[PDB]
Amino acid sequence: DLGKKLLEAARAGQDDEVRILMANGADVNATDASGLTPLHLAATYGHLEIVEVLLKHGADVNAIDIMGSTPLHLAALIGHLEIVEVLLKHGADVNAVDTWGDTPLHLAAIMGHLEIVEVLLKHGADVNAQDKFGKTAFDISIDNGNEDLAEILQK
Amino acid sequence: MRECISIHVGQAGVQIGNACWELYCLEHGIQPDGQMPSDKDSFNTFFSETGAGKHVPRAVFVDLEPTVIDEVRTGTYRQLFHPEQLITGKEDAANNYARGHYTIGKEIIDLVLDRIRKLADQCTGLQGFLVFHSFGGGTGSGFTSLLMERLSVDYGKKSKLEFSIYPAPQVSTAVVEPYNSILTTHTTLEHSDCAFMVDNEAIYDICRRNLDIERPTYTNLNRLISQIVSSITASLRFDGALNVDLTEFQTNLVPYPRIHFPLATYAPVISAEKAYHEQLSVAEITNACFEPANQMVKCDPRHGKYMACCLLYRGDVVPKDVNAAIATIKTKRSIQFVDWCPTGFKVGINYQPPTVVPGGDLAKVQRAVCMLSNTTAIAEAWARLDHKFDLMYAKRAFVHWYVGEGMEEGEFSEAREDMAALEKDYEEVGV
Amino acid sequence: MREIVHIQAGQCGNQIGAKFWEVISDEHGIDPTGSYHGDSDLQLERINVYYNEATGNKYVPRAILVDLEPGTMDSVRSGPFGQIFRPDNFVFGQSGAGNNWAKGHYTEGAELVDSVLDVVRKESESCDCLQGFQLTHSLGGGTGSGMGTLLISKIREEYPDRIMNTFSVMPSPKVSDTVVEPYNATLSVHQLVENTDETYCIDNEALYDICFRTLKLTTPTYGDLNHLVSATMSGVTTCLRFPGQLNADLRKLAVNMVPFPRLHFFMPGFAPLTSRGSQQYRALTVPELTQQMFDSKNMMAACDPRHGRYLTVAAIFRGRMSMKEVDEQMLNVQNKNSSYFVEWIPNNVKTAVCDIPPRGLKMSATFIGNSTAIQELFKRISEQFTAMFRRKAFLHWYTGEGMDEMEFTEAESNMNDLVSEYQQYQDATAD
Ligand SMILES: Nc1nc2c(ncn2[C@@H]2O[C@H](COP(=O)(O)OP(=O)(O)OP(=O)(O)O)[C@@H](O)[C@H]2O)c(=O)[nH]1
Ligand SMILES: Nc1nc2c(ncn2[C@@H]2O[C@H](COP(=O)(O)OP(=O)(O)OP(=O)(O)O)[C@@H](O)[C@H]2O)c(=O)[nH]1
Ligand SMILES: [Mg+2]
């Protein structure tokens, strides 16, 4: 099965191996045991080129894993701003909610990726979105004392 | 001769001991090298004599660190003390009672006992020991209580008198000082026959207004403390009729062995800058002995009852002036004694004026008086300590520092219970 | 209690550690060659605390420089005092850790940690009265965090009675946007809770905020942050390098500042806040220095003290100033902000005054506080950790080095209990 090979080729960042497996019929939307797609692992490990070649060959930009994490969730969490913009331009749900109530704005705010926060707000991120604990991205900024993030959310 | 051995534990005990022995030599006319030109009687209770006419104090200086005692080894009285009587460790108890009692203190206690035994072997008839130590220090509380326990075994018949430094926040160096104070009081209670507390706050305040010292330091406090301690031990080093030995201290001031904390009051305390002050009369200094602001421990004897009261005068004091001044106190002021005690004032007069130390903040006085009284109002000082103990112990704060140095946590409650019984002991006497 | 063995692990540990030696050597009058060049006796009174006297008035810093990548080997020598470090104390590895906490704690760092313990033993056995160890390191990396905590555990197992002090640098996305740093910090904090006696929380989040907002530095560099660190490390260690009575050693400071074993993470503060290359007439008054020490914009950790309660506080004042004025301003802030101090620990604020101010300053004020508000710092790292751990992001980097996944949950559980402990004592009343 070439799905497990494409999964690890997308994680390791082997662009040439991703293009070869795709031509050999590898499941682009294959999932590991956690439900992670090659687009998930590509967006997690900062492989922008593999992210683009995946979306160009039928990758579900809004695929969710077992915990409901989208590639935008992980890209905003790890802080790959370039992958975040590419995912958003390909139809990524900016307000996707995972199993913990977190939106891509929540993870970008918690991790201090202020530039990703500004891009998510520009693309329609719901500031009123609450996690499972009743906290919004603005609530996290106040609770953590992150004044720089609070001013960004106030625009 | 009925000799007395002084023991100075910790920094407070050593520094105050250094000020006391400086004052003793000045009172007895002893040069810093130990030579006294005016004969070489009664001063022998505190000083031994060598073949070369050198008078060595019967003093032991013990500290778990050498910094403070090295000042005595390289001070003005470097040649005065026996060099082997200056015992130092390398690591202090860190403000931990358990360190000075259970761990670090055990590494030097047997050496301290052997050096004390060497001094006791030079005594014809040892009275006992005067122990100088702090309440809040790890050594002054931990090692002292351990030393008091050991002295009770090797010298069961000898008397043990304490000069204790009550903690005060203005000069305090540790937050666990209420712990160390309560822990050392419970373990020393049965091993001490008489303990003169020195409230650092009372001495601090007297230095502030009575001496016009803005920020008093240990030097200012120790010079005043040594003035009071010398007034208490003057009867042991001079001829007299009141408190001639350590046994009389318990007989006159200690009706029950548990309530052995007499309140000391000294008067007058005049700044040296007012050298031309008018000489205060016997009645004025005697009335100042009942003013709460002249006392060594912050309390209100008007709120308590007297079980004993000794008046030790120094200087131009005619005994008929004491009786007249005492007859006015008994009549004018409502000074209530306990019903089971003679409503009387024991009076001892040393007709030599008090000696002022050069460099001190005290002025020369023609007459002074130190009042030793056992009043139930000193339980207020215990209450202030026990409250600070209860506030911290309720949350078990800083307790881990003590259990980590070979001390079970039950000793905290066992010491706190004994203090609750001590406060109760003051209640059954005066209601 | 005199000599301290300094250790610096990782890039940040050696960077802020070299700045520590550069700052205190200037205060002690020690030039990079190791000779004395000052004109004050207080600079040697306790010079053996951090320096070893070598040959011909040469003071070699008792420091050990550790790292996994050899790039920092030439980085310290490129500095001013790079030649003052002993070449024997340079224990560096072949390959770095790459921000992998497991690489420093289990694989690469564990392979080289035995070589560091050899130099630690060589410096410790050359100590007359070693009081403990101090370690500068960051928590976000792999060497200073993963191996630093391993060095702490192995040194504690070898010297259990010694004080384990650390200058730990908390990570922040404002300074380094590396997402695995919450992993390394949480695993390190789990180790610091069990194996250190005193930890100075130097939060990079607060360092960036002071430079960006207060100092008005648009682009603050590591030198701008380390300027605040070196000023803090010099202030918090003032009582250890100069003659004093309060907190003069690592254990007495720990006994006074650590009421509970796990709550040993201090919030340091410095006043006045100054940037390098731009110092101006400070002329800060004692009340201005007092109000700034307890201000949140002056805290080295991004925590609002007004949101928590002070368990213990040690204030250090440097420079020539009125001792009485410091006592009044200290008692005034405690009166004005009475609700911000725990009531069940009386006299929990301790004040020390040193006559030697730091470089380029006439008046200085250093704050050392054990505040329950430090949970805000731990909660921020916990939320960043939980955000990463719930998605299992980059978890293979750690488990690939033989590290168990349950160690992540155990570290997160322990830090969550630490936050719960601070909140528990934040809500406790005297009743
Ligand atoms: N009056 C007076 N009090 C002192 C002096 N030195 C210390 N104290 C007080 O004693 C307490 C501290 O105990 P120390 O005597 O310094 O300590 P120690 O007995 O040497 O114990 P460790 O050093 O902790 O092992 C505090 O309450 C101080 O205010 C002094 O010279 N005079
Ligand atoms: N304040 C301050 N933080 C620093 C400095 N150098 C690194 N850091 C912080 O330390 C963290 C990274 O740890 P480092 O010390 O660089 O790493 P290390 O301990 O050398 O470990 P490896 O490089 O992974 O082998 C990040 O949070 C950086 O912001 C410095 O000079 N000052
Ligand atoms: Mg001491």
Residue numbers in the entry:
A (entry chain F): 13 to 167
B (entry chain A): 1 to 40, 47 to 437
C (entry chain B): 1 to 42, 45 to 360, 369 to 441
Lines quoted from the article behind this entry:
Here, we describe a multi-reservoir, high viscosity extruder as a step towards automation of sample delivery at XFELs. After commissioning the device with lysozyme crystals, we collected time-resolved data using crystals of a membrane-bound, light-driven sodium pump. Static data were also collected from the soluble protein tubulin that was soaked with a series of small molecule drugs. In two commissioning beamtimes at the SwissFEL Alvra endstation, we validated the general performance of the multi-reservoir extruder and determined 13 structures overall.
Due to its key role during cell division, tubulin is a classical target for anti-cancer therapeutics including drugs such as Taxol and Vince alkaloids. Notably, 27 ligand-binding sites have been identified in tubulin so far56 making the protein an excellent target for SBDD. To demonstrate how this could be exploited for SBDD, tubulin crystals incubated with single ligands were loaded into individual reservoirs. These reservoirs (loaded simultaneously into the multi-reservoir extruder) were sequentially measured without disrupting the low-pressure helium environment of the Prime chamber and without entering the beamline experimental hutch. For this part, we determined 7 crystal structures: apo structures for both TD1 and T2R-TTL, T2R-TTL complexed with four ligands known to bind to different tubulin sides, and TD1 complexed with the photochemical affinity switch SBTubA4.
